[PDB]
Design a protein around this ligand. Structure first.
Ligand SMILES: C[C@@H]1O[C@@H](OC[C@H]2O[C@@H](Oc3c(-c4ccc(O)c(O)c4)oc4cc(O)cc(O)c4c3=O)[C@H](O)[C@@H](O)[C@@H]2O)[C@H](O)[C@H](O)[C@H]1O
Length: 344
């Protein structure tokens, strides 16, 4: 029938007309994509003479309310990144249009998944991975600023955009799930391949969840493939234990959902019983071999390549293991990740 005077559809989304003009300023160009929040469109800002992406939030109070929480987090980040030096796509503007909240951002055309797919999932060089890693840690250092204390909650290759597909500069998007430390609201957060063990275990979480995601992402960037590609939460936890072993007892003893994955023995914790191909035993799928530390890197493609010496790979493996620490209190933090020897 009639939704929002004919401007909306049955799913509370604005019906995008390729070419429409808004407020004598924005010329809608095309739909970029859809999400649970609403839609993203490409548009030309005629006043500032530049391409933008506009997040059109659903015309429904629950989604309006989450987006208003995010506008407040974005404005707070603007109050502390005047120089736009940290690698975040900042909010340019917010306004209401025909009962939709709209968020304006700089338009970037390619994300990190696009780069991987272009290499046919062979992975980017360790030198490029090093540069991306340095920028991501800087962005996380910025979010860890005391006044901010923002948890991103959805770091994944698709949410890291390329400033120019041949440049090394990146910028983070999508604070739709983010929250400040203390104001946590949701339990089912993070993309599954990049979901930290504390979220899988239903424990309280903090900014360390973003550093876990970063470790997974960096490994995928250089190998071409997701490190932990679980199809559901039990499969995700087991793939993590394949590489990292059983989580420390002092974590599982306080983990609300420890018994979804593990069994406490009369002695200690072990995995739950299976019926019949057992996953590789805990800790036996070594990062050392996933990265090909001594065999010319992933697929052996990096033999004799500068920046891919055995020493470089051992430094990279060491940083990744600090990022994939089961303990969110001892998991490496952004400032100290930046002083790691992987970055010289
Ligand atoms: C490069 C883009 O990558 C992917 O989108 C990236 C992410 O964009 C987010 O869209 C957003 C973009 C964004 C900025 C520039 C763009 O050119 C663009 O298309 C989108 O920037 C933000 C910046 C913030 O500070 C906070 C945010 O919440 C967002 C945001 O949600 C979506 O919410 C996510 O669902 C999506 O994953 C898609 O493949 C898309 O089609 C493609 O164009």
């Amino acid at each position: 029938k009639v939704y929002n005077d004919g401007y909306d559809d049955d799913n509370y989304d604005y019906i995008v007309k390729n070419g429409e003009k808004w407020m004598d300023r924005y010329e809608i160009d095309s739909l970029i994509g859809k999400g649970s929040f609403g839609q993203v469109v490409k548009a030309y800002d005629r006043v500032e003479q530049e391409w933008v992406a506009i997040k059109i939030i659903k015309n429904k109070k629950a989604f309006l309310n989450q987006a208003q929480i995010e506008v407040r987090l974005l404005e707070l980040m603007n109050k502390h990144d005047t120089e736009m030096k940290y690698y975040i796509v900042h909010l340019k503007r917010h306004f209401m249009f025909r009962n939709h909240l709209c968020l304006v951002f700089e338009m970037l055309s390619y994300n990190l998944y696009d780069l991987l797919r272009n290499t046919n999932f062979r992975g980017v060089s360790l030198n490029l991975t090093r540069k991306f890693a340095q920028q991501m840690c800087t962005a996380l250092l910025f979010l860890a600023t005391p006044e901010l204390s923002i948890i991103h909650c959805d770091l994944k290759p698709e949410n890291i955009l390329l400033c120019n597909p041949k440049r090394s500069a990146i910028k983070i998007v999508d604070f739709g799930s983010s929250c400040q430390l203390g104001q946590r609201i949701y339990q089912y957060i993070q993309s599954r391949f990049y979901r930290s063990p504390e979220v899988l275990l239903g424990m309280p979480y903090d900014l360390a969840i973003d550093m876990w995601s970063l470790g997974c992402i960096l490994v995928e960037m250089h190998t071409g493939e997701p490190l932990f590609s679980g199809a559901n939460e039990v499969d995700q936890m087991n793939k993590i234990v394949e590489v990292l072993g059983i989580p420390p007892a002092h974590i599982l003893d306080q983990a609300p959902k420890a018994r979804k994955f593990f069994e406490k023995l009369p002695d200690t914790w072990n995995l739950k019983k299976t019926k019949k191909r057992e996953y590789k035993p805990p800790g036996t799928r070594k990062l050392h071999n996933i990265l090909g530390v001594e065999t010319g890197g992933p697929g052996g493609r990096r033999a004799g390549e500068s920046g891919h010496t055995v020493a470089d790979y051992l430094k990279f493996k060491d940083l990744i293991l600090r990022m994939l620490d089961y303990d969110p209190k001892t998991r490496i933090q952004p400032y100290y990740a930046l002083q790691h020897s992987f970055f010289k």
